[PDB]
């Protein structure tokens, strides 16, 4: 298949060009909503934790894939291991609210607390990059607080992604990046 | 819609389980990929 | 192709399957699945590397105990050229119509 | 009981046939799957008989003495060259085993086609009949005929590293000559690859 | 019933030959799916355990019957006793993935964890014997890891078996293999 | 189908409970056993 | 003027095509005659492009300088093995000849397919256009494409003793470089056997 390379119009040659046959493909595993819909661990702070998806480590599956979207939307789920009661507060709340129990507060129940939280930002959508490095403080899902938080996991629900950005694999020093693969 | 597999209706109302979207007044990349040229630009011999 | 209008060339791309060392010359590679093309008004050429294997799926990662590549080699040759010394041929890669990825895994990286 | 088998431009006729045993299936499974991306082709020229000596059945051989022949084996014809020209292949086998003595010999051989045979133990020989097989009993016949399809965890194979089938001949009752029988019986195999398909052409050595 | 014994065509005589009567038979207990569908214990390794059905002891009911099939297919269930969280990884995964929590990870919950896992090999079917003793490393159901695994049980679901192979009973030294049978 | 005895539908979708089979384009031993010769090869007296 | 030619799992694309010259016929004559007694077969796997360097066209070459390539030539692929496995064969040729310099070179080459060529004399070169041919003129094209059928006094041939076709490339106007043209032009051939049929299988060397 020859074409004008300067154009940018996508070109997709197939094996039929030399007598082959294109097969069937099932791409459920690369569906955006599906792939981001799983828990990812984040290292927490002792007490006040602002819920911010950018805390996800950039090399993790969720962290890397989220960063390939410049704008995104999603509801949220958190699983938290904590001592004492856990209090959540919405986007825009005064930090002082974290100590008042009428704001969604989950009483301790071993071994952890799982909660479904709604998108709560004033923007129609959030971003992973903002040309204004550092993101506006309004880019968050509220905050939580407990006597001590030991584990914090995020899970994106109903995710939507806009405008793809670079996604980098590891750069090998050798001809191939070799890893020990699970084997009996 | 994503990684959810329960056959029973959620016990809680949708209005509580999730935030509710509002309207005003894979979309783009799916259309872009589907519009890809997939043939030969010239004449074909045998 | 990125050379000037008075630079011409003819290239060859081939796919050499696993089980035998990859070809070192265009003549030897001729017996593999391959395509040849030259430069002209259209600067771009696209070629599909076929999925050929014993099993229906192949691994994305490469095991450390894997010395010789399991899926073969892509071989890009230059048949000849006309005053194209130092000219660049840039190459890109994209997923084909039936490319498929399955079994998500978080391995670091 | 005359049977004539034809594979390409080669035929084999027997007047002491006990029929043919079809193993595991009557027809081959799909030859065009996603692992060859429609690039596979059939090579009819390789579907013909090639021959090989197995062993000499003598009176001193006792129960359990066996001979194994992994398939594919060394082939100096077109089928053999295919394994050097293509990376992936698949084919079934049409197997004819012969043990000619006369009707005054006694004893019995069991010939079977066994998949994935990584050596077999003594007690397991007692159950070799679980595999496609046929017996060679001098009072009745001199020929065994078995036909099997391609099998494997993969739709196509790499014969340089894997042999899906192993032909096995085992002595179940020792050979007897009794004054008028043949003094010994040489066992031969006449084999033909069936439905051979190849994919992934290799480069040459030049 | 006389016949040509060299043939191999199955011959099944009945008691009717001498005036008897063949009865009704119910063979649900020898159905392949049914008989393999039960847990079997395997001795585990402290931390990394590659899920491999060939780990089943050859003399056990499940181990013996599985080995009578040269090719097989099945989904899987595992019951595991472990300390810390249990992480499972699919076939083909880098061993390093066993430490990342976004891969299916079950948080500890006494007394054990039971999980349903899908077939995940690149082959259309797996084998108990491979003429290439030793089996290809791709013949597995992924791997699990925990701080310490104390018990591991496998259970084959929807099992399919192809091409029967030898199944051996114990060889007695006496005329009969005698065992103490449960009695009041 | 094997050793399962619940009369209620599984709470989770089939797509999650098990792997899904795909098609291309006791079977053999049952047919083999059913085809077995079960009489007498000769003539029968009384 | 883009032309893509496909022969088996091999393709060749040119953006400077002058079309294809069909020599002596558009289709092959009968492939099944009485001389093979219905034992002939087609070998599709051999109908693909193989490559070879011809010569280097330099400014010192003058009118009449030519290069001959008898067909079939040494082939290290499946087509080549066919000549060692079968006694009789026949096939046509799909020929593509390339001479890449640039549009600032001058001069001209004539490429022709000539049957039964037992050397040609100087004056006869003036009439080389009587044979299937095409010119390579740098100001216009870099590729010549000719397609010819099998020819001969016999319906099938014995390539070990006879070569029905000879590819010939001749300089008609000497190469000019003029400051901006390529300093020299290497001439290459991309050839594919067409409609290959074989008969009379040989024994092996074992």
Using alpha carbons, select from D35, D88, A25, A169 the residue that is nearest to residue C61.
Answer: A169
- Using DSSP's 3-state secondary structure scheme, residue G36 falls into helix
Task: Check residue G107 and give left, alpha or beta (phi > 0: left; psi -120 to 50: alpha).
Answer: left
CB-based contact, B43 to chain F, within 8 Å: no
Which residues pair with residue A73 across a beta bridge? Answer: A160
> Which residues lie closer than 8 Å to E116 by C-beta, 6 or more apart?
E75, E76, E77, E157, F17, F18
Neighbours of E9 (CB within 10 A): 15
The rounded Cα E160 to chain-centroid distance in angstroms is 11
Q: Which letter does DSSP use for residue G150 in this model?
A: -
With left for phi above 0 and alpha for psi between -120 and 50, is residue D107 left, alpha or beta? left
CA angle at residue A100 from A94 to A103, to 5 degrees? 80
Residues in chain C, how many? Answer: 109
Strands (E) located in G64-184: 66-71, 86-99, 106-115, 133-136, 143-148, 165-176
CB contact under 8 A, G20 and B45: yes
Pair of tokens at residue A84: 């004492």
Quote the CA–CA distance of G119 and G60 in Å, as a whole number: 23
Separation of alpha carbons G89 and G197, rounded Å: 6
With CB atoms and an 8 Å threshold, state whether A12 touches B35. Answer: no
Q: Of B2, B26, B38, which has the smallest distance from its Cβ to A34's Cβ?
A: B2
The whole-angstrom separation of Cα D192 and Cα D6 is: 10
What contacts D181, CB < 8 A, 6 or more positions away? D101, D102, D104, D105, D106, D138
Q: How many CB atoms lie within 10 A of CB A10?
A: 15
D112: β partners? D133, D168
Verify whether the Cβ–Cβ distance A179 to C105 is below 8 Å: no
- DSSP letters, D157-185, are B-TTT---EEEEEEEEEEEE-TTTS-S-E
Give the C-alpha separation, A103 to A116, whole Å. Answer: 14
Element (DSSP H or E) covering residue A163? strand A148-164
With H, G, I as helix, E, B as strand and everything else as coil, classify residue C70. coil
Element (H, E) at A38: none
Q: Sheet containing G106-115: give its strands across.
A: G66-71, G165-176, G106-115, G133-136
Q: How many CB pairs under 8 A join C and E?
A: 42
Closest approach of chain B CAs to the CA of G51, in angstroms?
Answer: 19
Nearest to E1 among F4, F19, F39 (CB): F39
CB neighbours (10 Å) of residue D4? 9
**CA distances (Å), G105 to each of C6, D144, G140, in order?**
10, 73, 10
DSSP helix/strand/coil, G113: strand
Per the CB < 8 Å rule, is C59 touching E123? no
Q: Cα–Cα distance between E103 and E89 in angstroms, integer?
A: 6
Task: In whole angstroms, give the CA distance from residue D172 to residue D106.
Answer: 11
Residue G161: both structure tokens together: 């003793």
How many domains does the structure of chain D reveal? Answer: 1
Chains E and G share 3 or more Cβ pairs within 8 Å: no
Contact D38, D199 (CB under 8 A): no
Dist. CA C95–CA A13, nearest whole Å:
10
Answer positive or negative: Cα dihedral of D31, D34, D37, D38.
positive
Is E66 within 8 Å of E167 (Cβ atoms)?
Answer: no
Angle (CA) G189-G193-G197 rounded to 5° is 165
Q: What is the DSSP string of chain E?
A: ----TTS---B---GGGGT--------GGG-HHHHH-S-EEEPPPSS-EE--GGGS-TTSHHHHHHTTEEEEEEEEEEEEEEES-EEEE-TT-BGGGGG-TTSSEEPP-TT-EEEEE----SSSSEES--------TT-S--EEE-SEEEEEEEEEEEEEEEEE--------SSSS--------
Q: Resolution, rounded to a tenth of an Å?
A: 2.3
* 3-state DSSP assignment of residue F30: helix
What residues does E89 pair with on adjacent strands?
E143
Query: Do E and D share at least 3 CB pairs under 8 Å?
Result: yes
- D25: nearest CB among F24, F25, F28: F28
Report residue A66 as tokens: 């989220």
Q: Output phi, psi for E66, to 5 deg.
A: -65, -40
**Whole-angstrom Cα distance, residue D163 to residue D69?**
10
Other CB atoms within 10 A of residue G117 CB: 17
Q: Quote the CA–CA distance of A65 and D5 in Å, as a whole number.
A: 62
Q: Is E59 exposed, middle or buried (0-12, 13-18, 19+ CB in 10 A)?
A: exposed
Alpha-carbon separation of residue E89 from E95, E103, G64, G69 (angstroms): 8, 6, 72, 60
- Residue G115 neighbours by CB distance under 10 Å: 15
Radius of gyration from C-alpha coordinates of chain D: 18
User: What b/e string do you get for C30-40 counting C-beta neighbours within 10 Å, with b at 16 or more?
Assistant: bbbbbbbbbbb
Strand-pair category, A126-127 with E86-89: unpaired
**By CA distance, what is G51's nearest residue in C?**
C27
Distance CA E124, CA A104 (A): 50
Q: Which of D83, G7, A18, G77 is nearest to C27 (CA)?
A: G77
Question: Which domains are delineated in chain F?
Answer: 1-46 (4.10.90.10)
Structural domain including G89 reads: 1-206
Residue count (chain B): 46
**Cis amide prior to E111 (ω within 30 degrees):** yes
**How was this model experimentally determined?**
X-ray
Torsion angles phi and psi, residue G184, rounded to 5: -165, 160
**Least CB-CB distance to F19: which of E3, E17, E118?**
E118
Interface probe, candidates G1, G5, G7, G9, chain A, greatest A C-beta count within 10 A: G9
B1 touches chain F (CB under 8 A): no
Estimate to the nearest angstrom the gap between the alpha carbon of D28 and the chain centroid. Answer: 16
Nearest 5°: phi and psi at E135?
-105, 150
Count of alpha carbons within 13 angstroms of residue G95, beta-carbon side = 32
Give dist(CA E181, CA C41) in Å, integer: 89
Helix (H, G, I), strand (E, B) or coil at A65: helix
Quick one: which of C30, C76, E1 has its CA closest to G11?
C30
Q: E58 to chain A, minimum CA–CA distance in Å?
A: 17
E90, two tokens: 């699919």
DSSP codes, D26-44 = SS---S--GGGTT--EE-G
Tokens of C104: 């998500």
SS3 G142: coil
| E90 to A59, B2, E142, E144: CA distances (angstroms) | 19, 20, 4, 9
Q: How far is the C-alpha of A89 from the C-alpha of A143, rounded, in Å?
A: 5
Distance CA D63, CA A117 (A): 76
CATH code assigned at G101: 2.60.120.20
| Nearest 10 degrees: Cα torsion A44, A48, A52, A54 | -40
- Helix, strand, or coil (residue C84): coil
Instruction: Supply angle C-alpha D141, D147, D150, rounded to 5.
Output: 155
Nearest to G201 among D9, D81, D205 (CB): D9
Please give the interface size between D and F, counted as residue pairs whose CB atoms are below 8 Å apart.
6
Q: Do G101 and C82 touch (CB under 8 A)?
A: yes
CA–CA separation, D138 and E159 (whole Å): 43
CA atoms in the 13 A half-sphere facing the CB of B15:
1
Cβ of C49 under 8 Å from any chain D Cβ?
A: no
* Pairwise CB contact (< 8 Å): C19 & D39: no
Say whether E96 and C107 touch across the interface (CB within 8 A).
yes
Q: Which residues contact A48 (CB under 8 A, 6 or more apart)?
A: A95, A98, A143, A144, A145
Please, which residues bridge with residue E73 across strands?
A: E160
Against chain A, the chains showing at least 3 CB pairs within 8 Å are B, C, D, E, G
Contact G9/A17, CB-based, under 8 Å? no
Burial (CB count <10 Å: 0-12, 13-18, 19+), residue D162: middle
**Architecture field, domain A1-184:** Sandwich (2.60)
Q: Name the strand (E) or helix (H) holding D93.
A: strand D86-99
Determine the distance in angstroms separating the CA of F13 from the nearest CA of chain B, rounded to an integer.
Answer: 5
- Rounded CA gap, C74 and C66, in Å? 18
In a 13 Å sphere around the CA of D41, the CA atoms on its Cβ side amount to 20
């Amino acid at each position: 298949t020859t074409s004008a390379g300067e154009s940018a119009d996508p070109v997709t040659a197939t094996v039929e060009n030399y007598g082959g046959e294109t097969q069937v493909q099932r791409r459920q595993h690369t569906d955006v909503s599906f792939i981001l819909d799983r828990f990812v661990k984040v290292t927490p702070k002792d007490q006040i934790n602002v819920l911010d998806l950018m805390q996800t480590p950039a090399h993790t599956l969720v962290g890397a894939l989220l960063r390939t979207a410049t704008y995104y939307f999603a509801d949220l789920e958190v699983a938290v291991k904590h001592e004492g009661n856990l209090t959540w507060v919405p986007n825009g709340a005064p930090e002082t609210a974290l100590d008042n129990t009428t704001n969604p507060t989950a009483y301790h129940k071993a071994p952890l607390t799982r909660l479904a939280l709604p998108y709560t930002a004033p923007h129609r959508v959030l971003a992973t990059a903002y040309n204004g490095r550092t993101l506006p403080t309004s880019f968050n899902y509220g905050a939580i607080k407990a006597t001590r938080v030991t584990e914090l996991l995020y899970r994106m629900k109903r995710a939507e992604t806009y405008c793809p950005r670079p996604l980098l694999a590891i750069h090998p020093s050798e001809a191939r990046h070799k890893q020990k693969i699970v084997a009996p | 819609s994503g990684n959810t597999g329960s056959i029973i209706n959620n016990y809680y109302m949708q209005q509580y389980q999730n935030s509710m979207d509002t309207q005003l007044g894979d979309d783009w990349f799916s259309k872009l990929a589907s519009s890809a040229f997939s043939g030969l630009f010239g004449a074909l011999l045998a | 192709f990125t050379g000037p209008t008075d630079a011409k060339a003819r290239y060859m791309i081939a796919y050499a399957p696993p089980g035998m060392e990859p070809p070192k010359t265009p003549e030897a590679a001729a017996h593999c699945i391959h395509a040849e093309w030259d430069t002209g008004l259209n600067s771009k050429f696209t070629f599909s590397i076929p999925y050929l294997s014993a099993a229906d799926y192949a691994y994305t990662a490469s095991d450390t105990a894997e010395t010789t590549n399991v899926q073969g080699w892509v071989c890009l040759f230059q048949i000849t050229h006309g005053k194209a010394d130092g000219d660049a041929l840039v190459v890109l890669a994209s997923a084909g119509k039936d490319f498929e990825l399955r079994l998500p895994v978080d391995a670091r990286t | 009981r005359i049977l004539t088998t034809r594979n390409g431009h080669t035929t084999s006729t027997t007047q002491s046939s006990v029929g043919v045993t079809y193993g595991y299936a009557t027809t081959e499974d799909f030859v065009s799957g996603p692992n060859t991306s429609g690039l596979e082709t059939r090579v009819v020229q390789a579907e013909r008989f090639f021959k090989t000596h197995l062993f000499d059945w003598v009176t001193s051989d006792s129960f359990g003495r066996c001979h194994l022949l992994e398939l594919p084996t060394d082939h100096k014809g077109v089928y053999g060259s295919l394994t050097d020209s293509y990376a992936y292949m698949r084919n079934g086998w049409d197997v004819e085993v012969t043990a000619v003595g006369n009707q005054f010999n006694g004893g019995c051989l069991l010939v079977a086609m066994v998949p994935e045979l990584c050596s077999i133990n003594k007690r397991e020989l007692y159950q070799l009949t679980l595999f496609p097989h046929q017996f060679i009993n001098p009072r009745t016949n001199m020929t065994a005929h078995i036909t099997v399809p391609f099998v494997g965890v993969n739709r196509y194979d790499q014969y340089k590293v894997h042999k899906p089938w192993t032909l096995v001949v085992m002595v179940v009752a020792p050979l007897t000559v009794n004054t008028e029988g043949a003094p010994q019986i040489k066992v031969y195999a006449n084999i033909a690859p069936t439905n051979v398909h190849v994919a992934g052409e290799f480069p040459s050595k030049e």
